[PDB]
Paper text:
The recombinant subunit vaccines Bexsero and Trumenba contain an important meningococcal antigen, factor H binding protein ([name]), which is a lipoprotein composed of two β-barrels that tightly bind domains 6 and 7 of human complement factor H (CFH). [name] is antigenically variable; databases of genome sequences contain more than 900 different [name] peptides, which fall into three variant groups or two subfamilies: V1 (subfamily B), V2 and V3 (both subfamily A). Here we use structure-based design to generate chimeric antigens (ChAs) against serogroup B [name]. ChAs retain epitopes from both [name] and [name], and can elicit functional immune responses against both antigens.
The resulting ChAs were named according to a scheme whereby fHbpV1.1:PorA151/P1.16 denotes [name] V1.1 with VR2 P1.16 inserted in the place of [name] residue 151. All ChA scaffolds align with good agreement (route-mean-square deviations (RMSDs) range between 0.447 and 0.614) to [name] V1.1, demonstrating that the [name] scaffold is not perturbed by insertion of VR2 P1.16. In each structure VR2 P1.16 adopts a β-turn conformation that extends away from the [name] scaffold. We constructed five different ChAs, in which a VR2 peptide was inserted into position 151 in V1.4 or position 158 in V3.45. However, significant IgG1 binding to [name] on the surface of H44/76Δ[name] was observed only with antisera raised against fHbpV1.1:PorA294/P1.16, fHbpV1.1:PorA117/P1.16, fHbpV1.1:PorA183/P1.16 or fHbpV1.1:PorA309/P1.16 with alum (p ≤ 0.01 by two-way ANOVA), and fHbpV1.1:PorA151/P1.16 or fHbpV1.1:PorA294/P1.16 with MPLA (p ≤ 0.0001 by two-way ANOVA).
Author numbering: 79 to 150, 150A, 150B, 150C, 150D, 150E, 150F, 150G, ...
The structure:
């Protein structure tokens, strides 16, 4: 059971492929994100690293997550002394999903329950699926291969559905990429990832931002990042319109051998 190992054991260099993943978007400052699986539990803050090295590659590892913030209320004790009573306000709760590759990884949050209108401690059930962090060894835009084509194959996973097949292709001469998502339960999500050019972002990493097409029809967008010194992997997300509103999908692919 490498989930509890990911929750209790420290980092290791002889672990396979991607060792660590910094949790920045999954937890904000002053928040506590508690993950539990296989009878183990660990609390995470803002800079904290998740030991993805113990997780299996190319699969979606699942934890139970609860997101809390701590408040110290002011009370008067037996005497007239000030006593602070710490109370943990549960902000969110659900399933925490992690997809691990060799040079990249991403987390997704399946919110099952949140606080209520005007709060007051009551939890209401409201589902949401969003992407957390997308981290790894970003490929430099200025160190991309000068030519050749590359076929990345991988997984597209959304709410209650992790069987999506992602297929992306990058021509490094034209510096362009395009792909498709297949075999998802929801038919409106099996979309084409339209051709768009490779761009450098603010830190000059290699990223691709294109349109999501459903029967040659624009119904959202997708963002991918290139990871690995030799552009081994891609990882990102997609926002797709459906009859049930907008859905979010996690994307992660790698070249094969
Ligand atoms: Cl008094
Ligand atoms: Cl949703």
């Amino acid at each position: 059971a490498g989930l509890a190992d990911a929750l209790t054991a420290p980092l290791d260099h002889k672990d396979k492929s991607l060792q660590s993943l910094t949790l920045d978007q999954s937890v904000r400052k002053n928040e506590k994100l508690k993950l539990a699986a296989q009878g183990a539990e660990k609390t995470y803050g803002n800079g904290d690293s998740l030991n993805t090295g113990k997780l299996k590659n190319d699969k979606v590892s699942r934890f139970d997550f609860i997101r809390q913030i701590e408040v110290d209320y002011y009370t008067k004790d037996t005497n007239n002394n000030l006593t602070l009573v710490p109370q943990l306000i549960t902000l969110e709760s659900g399933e925490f999903q992690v997809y691990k590759q060799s040079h990249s990884a991403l987390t997704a949050l399946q919110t099952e329950q949140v606080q209520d209108s005007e709060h007051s401690g009551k939890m209401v059930a409201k589902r949401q699926f969003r992407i957390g962090d997308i981290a790894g060894e970003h490929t430099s835009f200025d160190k991309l291969p000068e030519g050749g084509r590359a076929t990345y194959r991988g997984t597209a996973f959304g709410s209650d559905d992790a069987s999506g097949k992602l297929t992306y292709t990058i021509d490094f001469a034209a510096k362009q990429g395009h792909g498709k998502i297949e075999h998802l339960k929801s038919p409106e999500l099996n979309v084409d990832l339209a051709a768009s050019d490779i761009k450098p972002d603010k830190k000059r990493h290699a990223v691709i931002s294109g349109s999501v097409l459903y029967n040659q029809a624009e119904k959202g967008s997708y963002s991918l990042g290139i990871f690995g010194g030799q552009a081994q992997e891609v990882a990102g997300s997609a926002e797709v319109e459906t009859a049930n509103g907008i859905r979010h999908i996690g994307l992660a692919a790698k070249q094969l051998e």
